[model samples]
Target: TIVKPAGPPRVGQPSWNPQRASSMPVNRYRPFAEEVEPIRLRNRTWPDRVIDRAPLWCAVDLRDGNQALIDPMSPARKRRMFDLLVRMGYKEIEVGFPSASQTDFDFVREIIEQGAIPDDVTIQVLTQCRPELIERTFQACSGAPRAIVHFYNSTSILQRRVVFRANRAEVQAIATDGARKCVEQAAKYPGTQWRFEYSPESYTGTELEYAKQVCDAVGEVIAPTPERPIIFNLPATVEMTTPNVYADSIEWMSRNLANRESVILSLHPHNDRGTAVAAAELGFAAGADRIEGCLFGNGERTGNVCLVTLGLNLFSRGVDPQIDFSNIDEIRRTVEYCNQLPVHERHPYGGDLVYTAFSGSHQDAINKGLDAMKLDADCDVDDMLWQVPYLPIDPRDVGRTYEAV
Candidate 1:
């Protein structure tokens, strides 16, 4: 009445035999385990562990990113992007270049007037060393709950000779002026919590001692108290050399800097040659305490370091970078919309194919991995070691749903 057309039996095979007389369940017994004490370290450690402190993520999407777009975001789009940043739990966001254009100024005014700012969010504005521009930038943030007045001036030799037609001393004076103005602005806006930040505009190419002079002058002008710290953002403006070079520079600055406690060392990297993320990581390893960049690497030139890449890179290493980027797709979509730019499909971490695999061998392995994961109920899907094959991180962590077959 029944037809059996199989070459092998239903439950028995050379590889897997469930019907053997002495058959035993492969995974029926739980393994014994014991708690192990943490390994003791021989070297002296910091009073507080350095790595345990959560990283500060300063998103430059609205300002730096918009400047790169063919059609920069309209005021409405920038507001939407700001909302998205708040929703993504960004406590610090570089809003715009309020000093450059009326559009930027009005946008800042609009956000402040319309009550778009959250209590915890700190709006950051970038400006050059011009006093009137710095004043305009400060005015734009008059109503903000908290603000960071970021100041910068070129310190590189080429920028001095060609762009500004100035020597090292002239550049240092310009930078000092910016810092002093920023400090005065912070003092004037006592209604809002304020701090100062200075960048050596083309930091990577600047003479090491000159760059230090700019930072030292800014640090002296701001004079960050023990309670409130200033940030000195040392950006790899061109990313001219390797990651180690950037690291060494940062290490030299960290070691030689005088105002150790009064400053939060920050690093902003550009990917002209496509090593922004590497440079950022190495900069942190070399002693940078904060990171600044745009979401999905949208900025002028090649772009700012990909904040998504940096956060996810830290996430993969088991560190919670404090960014609520649970939905990276939403982040990509929102960023693309606000910037009026499309994401490259090959972009790392947030791309469409970041977790997809189409190769025959890869697909086969992925298929098996998914099945194994489904069968093994004890496995944690979020654990980096398990889950679908070829996935560097669990897609579900970012609200991604799908296991490519």
Candidate 2:
């Protein structure tokens, strides 16, 4: 015989009645799309397709992730992280915001003067759409072999009203002005191979039409050609809505941007709403060419999208992530040391407990799967299709063993 509680369940205790669902006031929070109309792509094809190729990956650990740190990495720590990123095959890396601080400026100069950067790798630096800042940014990267000068300005309605106190035309003018400054600075620095990237910061919070207008204005000033492409980075700065909204926005931008062929549509999604990874994948499906993110979604607020998770996700689908994580533990150690933050035990791919199993049924199925694999003595795990229970990808692929499971 069992005894049932007479009154309503306590806060932590379980109450299984169906009518109890209406107890909480869920209407207190506003809907994500209440501020603006959600983009509905009637013929959206992103849902039907699967990722077949890897997008151009850009590691923003140094600049974006560094800024979020309570105790930011020193020059030595920055160098260590930079070296790791290079060794792990990151072709494009956002080194720092040289215009923002002396430490960052010196680090940029140190790397270039010390010959620490590889010939194949390109370093990126961030700056606001201000003349002085852009000039200082160019001064910092004066002699680098190749560099991308990523300049951005806020264009969202909320930012305009609350931050800039400007109208639509004024905001567009700000972006265009910055675009001109970048072009002027690039001309002055002919020795270094200068590439330009423009971002309409808080793009998710902006109207689709206005966002395109600003990007087109910048593109016209920059005059991006096939040989020299401009990176039009669309960041979900606050992640205002769902993944599908972001995907629709990307597709809309892809179709509307001036000289689409000459632009490298890049995504820089933040995980404020915990959907940055999903938004990135959907953005790629909607024709994103590049992704900018930190290793484990380390940044301001909820942090940027996790590049490690994104890369491994592609790997699980039989696609090459292009970056090597053959020894993920080593990567984890370096990131932990530089970031001064412990990786959560339940973090995807790099977590301690990701490969562990406590369920008896799950263990039994995994054991049977292993036994079946063992029977095919001639078949290698690498060559065989991965179909293990509770594991979408092989643990050994990232240098993890199944002993714990």
Candidate 3:
């Protein structure tokens, strides 16, 4: 039995310092702005821009998402996840980092050799910008109908100074050399039609101008045409700032990249600050051409941006997200089984409890909306525009209904 205090239940300041309680010094952390100034997008257009079309969607669950697991997924589990992705219409899937581990390499071989990949789907492989890794990666991709050699290097000031103990010239050389080698290596795999993607790790921390130069060098080597374009995947490997700032960064790149016509500008946002969904939405409006994420947002740290949320966000807005998530719960169960990680009950769209409304006032309104809804008896609920009291998009659109509601 809780008792309310007499006059108006006013509360005072918190009894404990939150920073102290967390064992974190407030002063020790550097603000994102202090580490790197906001991108100089003075004449920014992203704020007023709108996402008029669907960006190309790619799933990185097999590579990045798998690596984040405590006990990483097994061969059979990875295969099951791969088949689920194919069934749900993911055209581009990052199967695994073939060069990183023997298990990953074997899985890549298993999928390719067993003819598990569909004709329209393209499998992408991740590798560091190194000669040996790139060579091994191509070997894993051998004999595919179509594949993307996704390579990357860390170019942030922290990585260059702390990790490499090298200067700018040395850091830049790594990328240029790797770019040349990716092209040279692919010529050896004549059986496969190849596409190329480059990601600058810790993009949110790197200097924007310098990041562009490195990507420009890689694009120069690939020499993308309209038909064979390069995918420049700008990943917030560690998400650093607000979603609006992320949009500013993306908008700057979109306006400035050389030969932009031949490059598909992609954004891979992490959920470190729990704003990846917002970042991705703003990124699309800011002129990104593609999005790379995991199903249910499983990846390193807080995980990659939730692709389902992004898709459903678009769907609710009446835009075709181009990915099918009609059977969302089934997909959710499969991912849970594969990752051994339980998605929160509050997860958007796919969560078991998202549709329920408990408060009497809220439930009453929703009940009224459903009762007052007008349509022919046999008409599919989708025959009418989705306009419920609290519900944004119709639950039925994603293989859900009002049982709990």
Q: In terms of TM-score, which candidate is strongest? A: 2
lDDT of 2 by residue, 189-228 (tens): 8989999999999998898889999999999999989999
TM-score preference between candidates 1 and 2, better one: 2
lDDT of 1 by residue, 63-96 (tens): 8888888997888799889988888778889988
TM-score of 1: 0.83
Residue-wise lDDT of candidate 3 within 1-84, one digit each (tens)? 554333322255365623222323557787887887755787878889878677889999998999999878998899999999
TM-scores for all predictions: 0.83, 0.93, 0.92
Quickly count the clashes in candidate 3.
0
The lDDT values for all models are 0.78, 0.90, 0.87
RMSD of 3: 4.6
Q: Can you tell me which runs of candidate 2 are displaced by over 4 Å?
A: 1-29
Candidate 2 structure lDDT: 0.90
| Model 3 score (lDDT) | 0.87
lDDT for position 160 in model 2? 97
Rank by TM-score (best first): 2, 3, 1
Which residue ranges in model 1 land beyond 4 Å of their true spot?
Answer: 1-53, 378-387, 403-405
